[PDB]
Amino acid sequence: GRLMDRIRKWYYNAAGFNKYGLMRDDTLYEDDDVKEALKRLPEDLYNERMFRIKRALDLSLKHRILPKEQWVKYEEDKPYLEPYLKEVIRERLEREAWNKK
């Protein structure tokens, strides 16, 4: 029942942030949580995430995109932050419910 995957992959190309050379998690809006996770990122993964964006902006300012061969691919997108994130949300969700007790 590959319905789901077919969709997720579609939408993925639909949103098309790959065209900019972004990763799903790059596009993440920096709310308090995300803000935290990012700080935890290992030097390298963080420094990489950075350039990607600075690159993307430079594109958007230029009104261009990456050549089709450089776009990212649904399965090659590395969800480098999700894990760091989930945990943050887990850590917080804990604290929060404990201050109610």
Partner: protein, 48 residues
């Protein structure tokens, strides 16, 4: 109903001329300056 009529159209003309010319000029200068950015090139060269 609108004595001005004429003078107003005479203006429209003048306005369209200045307008067109001054927009063109500005457009150059905008591009000119911005060039620095649109021409820009960057590379990510870590220490590896």
């Amino acid at each position: 109903a609108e004595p001005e009529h004429d003078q107003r159209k005479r203006m429209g003309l003048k306005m369209l001329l200045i307008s067109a010319l001054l927009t063109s000029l500005l457009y150059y200068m905008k591009r000119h300056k911005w060039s620095v950015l649109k021409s820009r090139k960057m590379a990510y060269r870590p220490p590896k």
